[PDB]
């Protein structure tokens, strides 16, 4: 339900940049850890999510490769490497958490975090 | 014989997909397939309505369905808070038929 | 413990397929499938016993079935008629071992 | 409603595979798959833990379960002198996520 | 009435021809409609048919590609159209529903139409 | 007395030998019968066997399109025709009965057999 992130912030193009993000609680079966990707002026989207219980990921087309979701164990906890920063890129993301599998809907995300900006510059 | 109360639920899980359910002596549920699953990427929730409040098992519940004609085959998850999430392979936009009976317990 | 009235029946469905079902408290059966499947096109009504009226469901049923040291996967749909649909691949002239649990609900 | 006893045991079958069981009126066992197989061949018994006394079938019972985010399934038989037997296909190194709801009657 | 039968005649080769078949009455489960053919003094044999619970079809290998079997929703009708005729097709054609799916056995097909009189000239 | 063993002894290379065992009964389902290879010195380990239940055969890599295993009926008997004896298969060979599936290990086999010398010689 609670959530709470760190990392991101400036970054220099083709750079690198760390999120993390770790849920208070476990709301249920199918728990999913993720983020969500909000470009300036456009519609949220969900751009990178695990699934807890049976390990396994979901990636967006446009950051396959280069983003990498992993989690730790007795810590309730997602992190997203992110390489090769484009320009495009920038935007502000939100953490997510949900139990019932990856949406793409916005709604019953039990967790949503306030969120954190992420500048790609020179 | 020994008769125990009988409740009845279908859903439209979504994609496609329907779900009948028969609930005995407010425990055994014994879910039939039914319909077409298409469009929906593995461990992504339902598109559909949710099992309603009576049906909600206790623990997750995988229910194993199978394609017809083929021998290919499927999961769903029925979740504690009533989401139903694919645990198939990656369906795109052709329809398959999906059959299949599974049971659980609520309590 | 509770105790309720059991029965037994043993159906050479055809096509090689054995099916041993148990009926428990006259609602609740379980499916056993043996032997090994051949020589049936999808879809197809398999050419041997049909199911005694005291097993017949009031409504259709499908049951998922395995075939062994493989991936491979079938279901078959035992009609209120007592015919059995053979509703996995078209299988060839080798047969294949054919086994797995399904229940059903007859009332 | 009526109330019957429950019993509930897990068993870590081995090779990564993981079995719920939940017997209900000393009779009915639902088996719920959990884990990731691994190592193991056609045929071969799962070098894990054996079905202890209370959940052991008068005979053996096939049980289908489904690999999640795949089209392909297994199954596995619980002998009656409680030894799991495996009957899918023949797993590499790599494990694969198990899941399934399989029931059978001990009595 | 269980089956009440349309169509059907008088053909040019190469040509096309439709044929009806609306049943008053379903039986049960795996409802199958189709058409069967009794070529003149030859073993009759299922030729076409239709599962309306699951929406799937059986040609046989004489007519595959040629004959197009299709439904239309509550109307519990089979329409069979009939392409590229060859004198060989002369036939009667039976109509045939049943419940339990597709089998070669005249056997238990609830509904038997009267038949049809097909016959294909140069 | 459970198993009872006969046949091998003394054969020329590339030559043939057979080996047979039968149960006195029966202990469960998966009923299984093979047979073990322990060479001078070396660990035993399961080389051949028959599921009654399945029709289903295990052979190890080394004596694979070599030897063969077949049953009769009504009469609980397995039997091992070697072919293509190499020098390197000169071994006691164990049979083995258990209800349970295929196993390596010297365990839940309800029969074991007090062995026979299988010798390759010039």
Known sequence: ?122 | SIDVPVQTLTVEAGNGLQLQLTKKNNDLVIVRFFGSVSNIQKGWNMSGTWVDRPFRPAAVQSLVGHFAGRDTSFHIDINPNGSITWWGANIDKTPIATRGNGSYFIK
Do not use: H
Request: with cysteine; proline share 2%; hydrophobic share 30%.
């Open chain 1, 1 to 122: 339900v609670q959530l709470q992130e760190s990392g991101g912030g400036l970054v220099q193009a083709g750079g690198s940049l760390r999120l993390s993000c770790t849920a208070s609680r476990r709301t249920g079966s199918n728990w999913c850890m993720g983020w969500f990707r909000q470009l300036a002026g456009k519609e949220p989207e969900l751009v990178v999510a695990l699934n807890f219980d049976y390990d396994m990921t979901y990636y967006a087309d446009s950051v396959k490769g280069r983003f990498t979701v992993s989690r730790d164990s007795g810590k309730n906890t997602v992190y997203l490497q992110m390489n090769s920063l484009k320009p495009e890129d920038t935007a502000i993301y939100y953490c997510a958490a949900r139990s019932g599998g990856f949406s793409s809907n916005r709604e019953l995300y039990d967790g949503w975090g306030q969120g954190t900006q992420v500048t790609v510059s020179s």
